[PDB]
Amino acid sequence: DIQMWKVSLQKEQARYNQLQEQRDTMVTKLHSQIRQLQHDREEFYNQSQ
Amino acid sequence: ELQTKLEDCRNMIAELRIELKKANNKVCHTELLLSQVESVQQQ
Numbered sequence: 001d002i003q004m005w006k007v008s009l010q011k012e013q014a015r016y017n018q019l020q021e022q023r024d025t026m027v028t029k030l031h032s033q034i035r036q037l038q039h040d041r042e043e044f045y046n047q048s049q
Numbered sequence: 050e051l052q053t054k055l056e057d058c059r060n061m062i063a064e065l066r067i068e069l070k071k072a073n074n075k076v077c078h079t080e081l082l083l084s085q086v087e088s089v090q091q092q
Contacts, residue, residue: 048053
């Protein structure tokens with residue numbers, strides 16, 4: 001059972017570590033939404049103002 | 050953008066050109082003036 005809890009912690013830590021890829025993915029999604037928001041606002045100025 | 054470009058189109062394409070034609074009308078009536086241009090009542 002000690003071996004079991006160790007393997008179990010290993011597996012749940014791997015599940016929680018996949019959220020590192022999730023963090024990078026959401027950072028990429030932010031770097032899309034925010035960056036396009038900034039580009040849209042700057043061109044909104046540069047033309048519509 | 051829609052409102053800005055549409056109203057700028059209205060101004061520059063309708064209003065500005067109509068005002069140029071109205072300046073032509075100005076010189077027309079000014080020409081009218083420039084071409085259109087004693088005490089017997091007492092006695």
